[PDB]
Amino acid sequence: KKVVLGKKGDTVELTCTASQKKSIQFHWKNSNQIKILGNQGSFLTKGPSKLNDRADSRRSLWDQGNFPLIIKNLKIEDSDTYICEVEDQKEEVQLLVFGLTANSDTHLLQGQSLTLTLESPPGSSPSVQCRSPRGKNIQGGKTLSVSQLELQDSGTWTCTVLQNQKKVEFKIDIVVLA
Numbered sequence: 001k002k003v004v005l006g007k008k009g010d011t012v013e014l015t016c017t018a019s020q021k022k023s024i025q026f027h028w029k030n031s032n033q034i035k036i037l038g039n040q041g042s043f044l045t046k047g048p049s050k051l052n053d054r055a056d057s058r059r060s061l062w063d064q065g066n067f068p069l070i071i072k073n074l075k076i077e078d079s080d081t082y083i084c085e086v087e088d089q090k091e092e093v094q095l096l097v098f099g100l101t102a103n104s105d106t107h108l109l110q111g112q113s114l115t116l117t118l119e120s121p122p123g124s125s126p127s128v129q130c131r132s133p134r135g136k137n138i139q140g141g142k143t144l145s146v147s148q149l150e151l152q153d154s155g156t157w158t159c160t161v162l163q164n165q166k167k168v169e170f171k172i173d174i175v176v177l178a
Helices: none
Strands: 004-007 012-014 026-030 037-039 045-046 069-071 080-086 089-098 127-130 159-163 166-169
Touching: 004 159, 004 166, 012 089, 026 159, 089 159
Parallel strands: 004 089
Antiparallel strands: 012 069, 026 037, 026 080, 037 045, 080 089, 127 159, 159 166
8 A cells, every 4th residue: 555755864744534524533553553644532632652752743624524644753663554544434555664774974086986775674675876967876775886987076966766656865965086
């Protein structure tokens, strides 16, 4: 069902739209049924889980049949199936948080292998397509690599990743001396 991918550090918003009579009783949970957030009657109630100080909702839409789940500071461990339950309707949504980093420090001199990675979640091995201002790209996933570094690289590289029919991209900055 809903595959939604996030970028480590940034926020995401999953969707949960109801088929009811506008604005009702609902809640979001994680794979194991520990409640994340819902509604003590008319307002929002977030449990005590590991995501409380960073989980949220938009109660203004609990009027037009929508109950989202907002998460800030995306951690890769934040990945797992979340479930929304709006009255008699259940809705599965898997979150895959991906983080692309520069196993160097995102800087480099003129001539040495540049290594990135892609730190994955509890349930995945992903595919990377990092282009570069200079057309080409590398492949693989968990670690990519290069070999030598042609000085025309202190610009913007582009880095896409697509999971279970869905995609995200980490456009990065690289630096090359002389």
